[PDB]
Design a binder for this molecule. Sequence first.
Ligand SMILES: [Fe+2]
Ligand SMILES: [Fe+2]
Ligand SMILES: [Fe+2]
Ligand SMILES: [Fe+2]
Ligand SMILES: [Fe+2]
Ligand SMILES: [Fe+2]
Ligand SMILES: [Fe+2]
Ligand SMILES: [Fe+2]
Ligand SMILES: [Fe+2]
Ligand SMILES: [Fe+2]
Ligand SMILES: [Fe+2]
Ligand SMILES: [Fe+2]
Lengths: 247, 245, 248, 244, 245, 244
Amino acid sequence: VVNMKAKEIIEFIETFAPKDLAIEGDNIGLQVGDNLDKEIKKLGIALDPSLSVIKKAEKEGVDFLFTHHPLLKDPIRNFTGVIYKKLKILMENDIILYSAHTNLDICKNGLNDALAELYNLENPKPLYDNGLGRVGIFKGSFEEFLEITKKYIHKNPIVVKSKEVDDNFKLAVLSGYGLSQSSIKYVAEKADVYLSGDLTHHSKILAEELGLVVVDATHYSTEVFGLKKFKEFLSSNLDLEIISLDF
Amino acid sequence: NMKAKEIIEFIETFAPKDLAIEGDNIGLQVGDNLDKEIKKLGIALDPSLSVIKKAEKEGVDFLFTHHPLLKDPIRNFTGVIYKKLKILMENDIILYSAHTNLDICKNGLNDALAELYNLENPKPLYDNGLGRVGIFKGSFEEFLEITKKYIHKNPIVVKSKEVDDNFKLAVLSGYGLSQSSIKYVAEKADVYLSGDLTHHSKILAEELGLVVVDATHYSTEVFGLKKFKEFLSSNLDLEIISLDF
Amino acid sequence: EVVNMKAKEIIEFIETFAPKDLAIEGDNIGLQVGDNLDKEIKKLGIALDPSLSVIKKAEKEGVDFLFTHHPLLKDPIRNFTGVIYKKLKILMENDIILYSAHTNLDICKNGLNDALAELYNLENPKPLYDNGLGRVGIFKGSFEEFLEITKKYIHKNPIVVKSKEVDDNFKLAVLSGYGLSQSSIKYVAEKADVYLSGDLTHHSKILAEELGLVVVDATHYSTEVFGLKKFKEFLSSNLDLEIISLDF
Amino acid sequence: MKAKEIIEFIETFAPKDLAIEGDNIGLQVGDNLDKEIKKLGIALDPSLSVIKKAEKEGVDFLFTHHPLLKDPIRNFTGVIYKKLKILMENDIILYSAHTNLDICKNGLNDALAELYNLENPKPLYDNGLGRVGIFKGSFEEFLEITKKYIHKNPIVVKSKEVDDNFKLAVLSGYGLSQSSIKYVAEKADVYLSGDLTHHSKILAEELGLVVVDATHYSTEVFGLKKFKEFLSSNLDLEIISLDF
Amino acid sequence: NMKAKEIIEFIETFAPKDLAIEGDNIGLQVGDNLDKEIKKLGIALDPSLSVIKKAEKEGVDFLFTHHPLLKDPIRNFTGVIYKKLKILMENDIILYSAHTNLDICKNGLNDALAELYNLENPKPLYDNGLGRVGIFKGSFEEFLEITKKYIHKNPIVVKSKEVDDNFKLAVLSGYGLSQSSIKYVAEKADVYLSGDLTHHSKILAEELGLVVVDATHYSTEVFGLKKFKEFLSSNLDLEIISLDF
Amino acid sequence: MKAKEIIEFIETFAPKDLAIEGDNIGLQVGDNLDKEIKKLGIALDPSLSVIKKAEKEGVDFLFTHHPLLKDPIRNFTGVIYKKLKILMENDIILYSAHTNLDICKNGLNDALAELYNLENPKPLYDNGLGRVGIFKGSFEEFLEITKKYIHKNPIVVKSKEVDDNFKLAVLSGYGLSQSSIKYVAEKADVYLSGDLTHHSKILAEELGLVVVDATHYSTEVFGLKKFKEFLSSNLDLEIISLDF
Ligand SMILES: [Fe+2]
Ligand SMILES: [Fe+2]
Ligand SMILES: [Fe+2]
Ligand SMILES: [Fe+2]
Ligand SMILES: [Fe+2]
Ligand SMILES: [Fe+2]
Ligand SMILES: [Fe+2]
Ligand SMILES: [Fe+2]
Ligand SMILES: [Fe+2]
Ligand SMILES: [Fe+2]
Ligand SMILES: [Fe+2]
Ligand SMILES: [Fe+2]
């Protein structure tokens, strides 16, 4: 166990998930920070750079805060309320905030590959062109798929049973939010079952009409699974204390 | 009997089309002759394929839905939209929608929720006219039981903070739980009741200390829709059924 | 010798002649109205326009596959009333498939523009635009031998904007349908002496006069129907299938 | 009289605020508006031949209905070079009243409305274009008036039979776009305008709207002649027409 | 013994935020609690790094700047903006801005210039209400003498034409010498007083025969800012200093 | 020589494809390019007085660095009227090589780079504007070269102390925008350009970038004079300068 500098953590992460992989206009990289020669005693991993995560980072003496989601998607020019409180804590404690978003989704053994491997997808391919998600054939019954889901991801997934599903069906997976109306239409042409998160009403109705079976294992869980794999990957390779904050 | 235009004038008297949010696809969805004579009106939340199939089966002549058939325009007619239009057209079933104009109007879907909780001194939540906000004269757990009894028995409760009696309560029928809505409503109420909660919105409400209650998109509208159906039945000499509720 | 075909077989044959990739950007080609393409087809109807009367005539003649050059809609819609209601009703209750080959039929080999280029026997023909619309080449003859061919085979009374005297062996551009927009006039003025197309309007006439471009309006309809008949003769020769024309 | 005084007279008759948004009305080409004007020319189009003819007739003030340019430019070659050259070396002022002349009272559309003696006339569009009203007569008395005063051989799209005392809409110039056909079909039995094209013809047939194309040129020149005679009556000034 | 609400309310009384040009980033720039108690107010033209550093050294808790901290929004916090927010946040210094609303308001930055030259019948130069234009009751050389004495000792003068006495003078505090501004003002005045002249604007002014006087962006605003500072000091029981002037 | 031959020579030296964006380069005003040329005039700006001077000196081919118009127009009044009238009545060709003259080799930026003899010079931006390199010397010999050859009273924003053998970036014309300051601050210690404004000054101070404003005019005229000497050396043609 040893102290690392900020650059060295960043180059290691960017080796695993190159910034080249992020879809256009994704706010990846350094979120908050100035000096990358800052010395790091404690790396914190989180899904969200939420207020309570940042408070907890300060309480636990985190020096480098890694989050999957960027601090801001839409840019701002006034600093009040919640964003004031978050930046104040990060700045007063001089805590570095860094994010790997879609580049962590897409890269090999990333969040989507983690799901694809979990379901042991036969000859998996990118679901989208950019290329988010994985699609392939699940060599098993629908109910062995659900049991794997319940065991490793979320024990109470929402199932939109739009049609009967035969063994050896085509399965698409997308970590996080993949259940938009436009996504449903697209995936309906490519798979029998769609595993993702953040189901809403209109998407549910749409999936039923198209006969696409949708499984909502929550936005949180479908990502945290991969994040745990990512956290174990860092711990094995870096001589550095690493904790998780919101999982 | 009664003609289709006569059904439309009644609805548009209650919920004028001008009340609708800009570019909301309200009004006649599918139909040609409005002097068509109507013996059986059907009410639905969604103009879904199964709703439309069920309408044909039940001999519905006028299909009223809260949601429009299409939000985004199209120029090809294949797959699901082909089947839906084929059924409606071959049977000459009129499809008509009152969307946000039904949300906003007096005694509409939001007012229905506002009355249920008996909100003291109610006001529109947004300026365009969506949602209601007011004081709930009671404890948080009397609010929750009313929710469980009349709306949805298993609402997701994001308990961002302790809630004292006589708190500010905002209600929005349908989809009111976007990130933009959370930020806006956090400044106007202590508790926000709506539908279609997603992760980022949940996190955001927690940061802002807004208590959010997701009683589902479906249920928070169907409540008002049932009231609307009873209103139509009281005033129109016409067989009226509900299709997806 | 006369036989029923499935819709997909007809579509694949047409797309062999006029591949869908040949169509210019955002052109609404392909399946307009229909669902099941294993539908069996006894009667193919060809039309220029998917007009209300064309569709009525298709239903009256028991057409099962309706091919039109123009798409049903250029601009998308989200309400279905009036005329579009009547057209979709007829097509759907009768399960008539509506399918379109638009600019891909204009551009392809032996397509609508090639038909014109071939008619006028254009020496060393080239595409008029880069996307692939129109043909331009040398007309090996006088201007009035050009006019007589036009009057005999395309339209008996074409509008001629005589912007200048035209010498023999002139450059002739052809564009089936609507090629007489102001931007088109300016562009073609740099590439040809005479421009044969359809749908002339006032400002375009004035503009052609200023540039000295001779414009011949043989109508939108006729400059396309000529090629469409060739296309219909092509289908009739290759498919054992009853094929009629509806608006020509 | 000076150019500004002529301009002020025209803008009294057709105020510039009446023009639909982004219509390129007003001074097209010119510098000194205190210049004194000895010969005014009226034209439909500021075409090359119109401008050449203006210089030949010694016109110093050229009024056109259509603006010189709709689309702005930043290079000066070819035809636009020649037109600006002729106007500038001879100090000929080019001025346009476009849709404001269409919309204004006794303007181009009103001229048509008065010609057909439309009973209880109203503007066809909300912005101010076109007139619609009832024609107190048969369809063929409408045609006879058209053939006598506007165009001897108008294209008639007879989409349906027309009863006496029908609703007649008029729009001088180009009113036969697809969007216009759809809109006017809800307001009239017969539509008189110009510049018919194929798809618009088909659309009118489907909707049962009877369309009469008396050409873009003729439906405007009629009003322009009225406008020219109006100027001649009020201004002590030599006034000629150039393309009509 | 004054809190932030009261200072902000006072400023917005003088220069209402509604007077600001559309999408002008006025108001609270950096801050959270406005019940914070304020004993030392700092006034600055620019919220620059050195201004903010100087604010910390002088123990300023409320920092007022004419220019907003950011015009273009950002979503990353590194480099210079990191340093600035860090200083403001750990010291809990409130940053608040009155920009174009201070330019336009009565007795604001533009009116300050108009009074200085004693413009007869002054009127707003633009429709949004930036700048003042009126007649200068004097010669051009009395105008320059007032300029050199009170604004800037050596202003750039683009003498595009001779200027007669009792000429029309337009003034705009800050940056008013854009090419479009030159075209517009050329039609309304003989002489244009502003700041931040660039080449193309100089050339354009010469062609149009508009005499332009560049008394710098800095000086034409600081003049009004000094009036504003003295106004605050007269009305507020509070230590008030200037930072970059 | 014919006009096309001159254009062809210039475009050999500064190819039009080198220009950034839809930069309004090339033929500004003119029609016949088989015109034979009696006097070529070179100017920085196609200003009214430059054009007046061109007509006075009997220039028939007017070359300017800046285009006549950046934004397109559809009305021809006031100043643009006066400029076009003079050019058209005298049949004077107006032609511009703008950013293609900035970017090309031995162009305006290379001229500055050579003046300061930048060791190992490179393009400042990716499109190819400006040059950056090492100035083998102290800051005050950089200033002494600036005051003697470019402008006697340059504005110096001394954001920090400058060591010998520092990185110097040059951009002829307007390179002192806020976005440019931010970009260059990461690539150089000293930035030599023109058209400094307040916000850019403040920004340079925060970033520690030393900015030297030797005016928009002078930083380009330096290169333009070299370009004029090049044309004079290669073309048998009377060549004068108009605004420098
Ligand atoms: Fe996510
Ligand atoms: Fe993700
Ligand atoms: Fe809804
Ligand atoms: Fe709703
Ligand atoms: Fe066509
Ligand atoms: Fe075509
Ligand atoms: Fe017209
Ligand atoms: Fe007109
Ligand atoms: Fe300013
Ligand atoms: Fe200002
Ligand atoms: Fe330059
Ligand atoms: Fe320049």
